[PDB]
Amino acid sequence: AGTVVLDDVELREAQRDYLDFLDDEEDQGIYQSKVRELISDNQYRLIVNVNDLRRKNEKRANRLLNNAFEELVAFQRALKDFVASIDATYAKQYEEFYVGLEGSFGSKHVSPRTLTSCFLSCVVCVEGIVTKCSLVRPKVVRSVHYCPATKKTIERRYSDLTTLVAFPSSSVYPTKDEENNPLETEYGLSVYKDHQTITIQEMPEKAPAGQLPRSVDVILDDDLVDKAKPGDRVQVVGTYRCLPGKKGGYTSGTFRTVLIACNVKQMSKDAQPSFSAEDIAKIKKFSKTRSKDIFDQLAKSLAPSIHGHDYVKKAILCLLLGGVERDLENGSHIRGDINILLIGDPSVAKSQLLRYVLCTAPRAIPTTGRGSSGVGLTAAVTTDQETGERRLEAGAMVLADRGVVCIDEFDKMSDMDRTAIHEVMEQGRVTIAKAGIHARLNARCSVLAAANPVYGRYDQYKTPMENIGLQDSLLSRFDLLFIMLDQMDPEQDREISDHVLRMHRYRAPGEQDGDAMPLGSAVDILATDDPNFSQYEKHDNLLHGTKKKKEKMVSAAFMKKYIHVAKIIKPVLTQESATYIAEEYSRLRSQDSMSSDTARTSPVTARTLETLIRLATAHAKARMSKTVDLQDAEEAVELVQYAYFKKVLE
Amino acid sequence: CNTDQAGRPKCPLDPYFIMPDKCKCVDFQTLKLQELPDAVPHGEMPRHMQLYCDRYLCDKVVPGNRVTIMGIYSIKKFGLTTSRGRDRVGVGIRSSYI
Amino acid sequence: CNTDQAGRPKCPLDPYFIMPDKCKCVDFQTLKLQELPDAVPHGEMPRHM
Amino acid sequence: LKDYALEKEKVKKFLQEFYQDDELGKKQFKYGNQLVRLAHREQVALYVDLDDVAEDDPELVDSICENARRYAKLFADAVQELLPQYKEREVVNKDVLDVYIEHRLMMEQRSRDPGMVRSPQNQYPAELMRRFELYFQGPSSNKPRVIREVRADSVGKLVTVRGIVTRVSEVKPKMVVATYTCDQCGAETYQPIQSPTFMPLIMCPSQECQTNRSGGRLYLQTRGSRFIKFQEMKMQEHSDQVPVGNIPRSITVLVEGENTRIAQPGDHVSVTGIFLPILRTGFRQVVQGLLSETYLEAHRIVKMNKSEDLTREELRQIAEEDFYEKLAASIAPEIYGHEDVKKALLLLLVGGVDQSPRGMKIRGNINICLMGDPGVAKSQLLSYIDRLAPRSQYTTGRGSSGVGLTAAVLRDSVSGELTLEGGALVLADQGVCCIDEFDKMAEADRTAIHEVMEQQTISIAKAGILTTLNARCSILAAANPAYGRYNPRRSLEQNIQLPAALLSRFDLLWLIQDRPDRDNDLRLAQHITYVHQHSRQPPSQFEPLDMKLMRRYIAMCREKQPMVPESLADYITAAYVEMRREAWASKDATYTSARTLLAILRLSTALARLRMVDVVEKEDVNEAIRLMEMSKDSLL
DNA sequence: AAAAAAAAAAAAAAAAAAAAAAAAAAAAAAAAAAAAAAAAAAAAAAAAA
């Protein structure tokens, strides 16, 4: 053969439609700005919301989603044309520009179980958990060969025939000149694109509870390779395709299918935020208006469904803001995470606070007493069994690096596990070694833990030392230790019960009118978008989640935005704050700090001094202060003074 | 190559390669069926049968289901090339399925 | 074909074609020799070579 | 694009007339002298510093870095063609490879007939005849890369990466040029080897066997063939360049030649090399295309921070009477207090001197157990010593237990068989093993540590393994004595809770208790607030030494074997018998044995090493005894 | 608190079928060309006043 096409009508029309869609200037300017932004960010993939195409062109959107390969070829040619129009040299740098897809794939949004053969050559959106990743390998796309005898230089092109027919002429590597002079390959002048394969499995929480998991293979090519690691929950948008078998004279009719990714995005749509100019202005005004009691307002707005526990909510706000790590020049390290332990009577809502943090913070990992044992909590070392090499496996605390581990039923863990937690809790790292490999994994996680005292209910007539069952070294790791009692006072009972009944009465606004909460039975989730991978008035409207209109509460979305901005602040200890903190620490170390019939809940060590510093720093962050002023220090000291002592009754 | 008329010079032996994107594929599942426990004679190993399901029969059942299957008792037809190793003293035997 | 690349598929059965420009050709003539007329026996057809 | 004849002339000019003033402001033609040494077979590896090339041809450096195999070949050719004119005398034929080379050259000149045109396949391959290796020291203008980020866009480029060596194979003969001989002809056949595998030749291609149309079967031979020292190492990302939720990424480094035997497992190295593919033939691959493995082809391996391989004032502070105190106070200056603890840790770093009398080895290593209350910088001191010592390993709790401490047999990858890999106590052999949370260590590990601290070996007789490992490592342990806290109502040996054997193995059991104390708590809190405020320890009388300088001083003190005089024997004996009498008389004392006397002796020899004298003096003994006494001071 | 147990539970090694992949692979017949020779018609030059 050797035929060329003379202005194919469908490809011409498609490229015209796609370039019309991309050239957004008479329209809102969205994708024209996006293409500028990839030029400036020095990238060559544009992610296109398919809903925008449906809005602009139903016919393109449907044809693209149902005939993915040639449509995507048209739309990448149109993208290259458009990029050249904006900037021809940038378009000259990259051989091809790519298009990823995003948005709402209605029936094309599948799971690895539901990705059947009717989606072949369609765009699909598959969600699952990465079970295995291959190594990132380079695949040669253009080899350059020098002939030392003739001084000639040769280039050979290898087209991407991953899912196409590949005749053997298409894969020969040149080794000889025409008259059998040897060629030497120019590695630096050749072009490679790196290639990866991952397997996506149906998420265990979404799989039918009875049977074995279903998987799909995914080919990742350049820009997309290291986007996912084993254990990650990801969306992969791409084309579902049959791979060719080898040449043979006989075939079973059986084909091996893969998904060729055009886009990979993490479930952590909570690990990447989006700030508009108005959002930033709102944050700045919220911080400037009341730069004194802003912390209290944020704390009291934290777990609105839980009544009470004002100090505990302040402490959780400090944990969510964190301190600042000290990275000394000689490589030494002081941690900047706050670890909190909640001891208390049954049914005082400490699991509710852990659940709130789980649904609120980014990179938050849940774990219960005996459901994460040994190597499931810190890292593990296993042997590859294919290459025979040792590999690392990240446990709960490595996966929560720069995040939170919410350890529920902390008292029901084994002592082996609780002593494995020590190094992560203080030095923020996991050190694991077998013979062929030794690593030091970063686990810079804060620990929010909830436990019951020994005897299940807290005895008020015993010291907190013997109600908590924890040894002093472990207790020292937790910088704040809250005893949450069930004081059966009638007045506090009235407060709690009125609150609880108001939350049991609340009905969502208009969305519901007397109806039930759907179970979400695995075909309903694929019907809509996944909120996990999905795409701000500073206050909530008041109805009866609160009794009366006397004090406003911060919006959850705005609070996420505000805390994300404030977490980056690095306030500095001022000399007055440092002197005050030092004096308070020396007072607190002393016996006069505790009266008679009051007892220490946890020991006061140098870790308590860093606790004061970290709490004061978090308080300063809440105000966006850039300095740790005396008010921050005294707030931290009252937190510590509250948590570290308990009156014992007779 | 059957079209060796559009030119006098000829094509090779075995010139054909499957075109994977031009193939119409359908769904495909294999099931293992075990004899019903009440139907197994008293001291007796259960009988098994391999089942071959297809487009909309795929994923209609799960392991553990009691089913009634209707289908063709058929043998595998992959080309009378039987050269097994240590076992299989048996000649003229092909794998059955429904 | 001599070349092998196990990852790549094999070449066809009879793959080789003479490249005519890469060929060293020489001059080439065929003659017909008859037995010398004075060497032929009397009643006898001449031999040829 | 570029003419390689011009480029070879460029590199020839650079080699011939590049000069510096390296030896005391003297222009010396840095690469000409090395070419002379290479021509006389007195030097094997030539390292071309691309900083030197950039000094006078920066675009040559850019070309080198963007196609590095080509320029390694060009530089090797230029050196080959320059060597004959830098030869001043006759090589003495150091080895057998030289004998082969000069027999081949002799026979080639003998049957030369120079004007004749030979076949291109009828000479010696260039790599068969070199005896030199050429490597690049990458320009300092190229920033070091992260192993994760060395990808397909850097194939064929000269890159530098940094990492920890996790696994390095043994040096093995990799064949570079296979040599065969014939049963018919008396010529030699040569098969240069680029692939990871080769098919040995069968027939010889010699002219004399092509004329004879004989059989001419050829025989593969190690004798005339050419091999190179070859190691395979794995190298891991540093903890500080791994992304947030990830594990470190390994890269395979193919080390060969004069670059072998530099990196051992656990070393922090910086490797310059070319990033190259290895074709992935054979594997019936899911994806069509030419997929390949990658590796780093090493050019320059440099051991980094703690693995790193003096001015008159320097010797002035070494000879200063306060050198010991200054070094000890440089130990983690961000931890306030712990002055004598830091002195003891300094002695552990220096160590005593091993004695081998009449076949009875007694170690020189010093072991120290810090058993203290919570939050007293034990883990910080352990971590500092791990950062500082040259061969240190840090282990915590039970994350590296069992074969993470001893050895395990592991499937080799290079050939494929069962190779022994050492754990922490082998990677820390002749260094420091920092064992944190010692009281919460699995009992099998504790028994292994018994044998390590006295015999300095690990004996294993499990199924796949029957060996004795060398573990000549000092042990720096940290523990909490009993229930987290020291309580005076109970004796030592009850809140120490170490068996007399294990307890006696430690030269110093340092007790730390943080009893509250108002002015002392203020001093600590001020120190800590300053550290949090400036990311450094507060100014003091004497600025603490750099870790590089501390390492240099400790290393100099190491090869300083001092002896114990006969004159001190009575003084030392009296100190020992005294310590032993308090142990007997006291009712709250730990186990005292002859190990206490050996501890005196090796502590005092470490002090003497710190004074860099060759004879232990009475003040060294005096300070050693004071340290042993302070180690149990907190219980007073 | 440690001392036997008594499981996971990881590895190395084995099997052990599948199901796919890989590897082997000239001689017989035909036709066309170019050359001959042969039956027939056609076109020359010797005859005479």
Place this chain on the structure above:
DNA sequence: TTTTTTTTTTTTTTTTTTTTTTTTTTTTTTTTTTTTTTTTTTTTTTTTT
């Protein structure tokens, strides 16, 4: 310059050979991969005086 026999000589073919071209064509092993055991090295819940 009317009649008349050799002479070709262009046209039908036919032979006919020699040479180049054409036409034909599955089976059988091997191997990786997956999924199983199985001995051994730990290691995690069992109890006592």
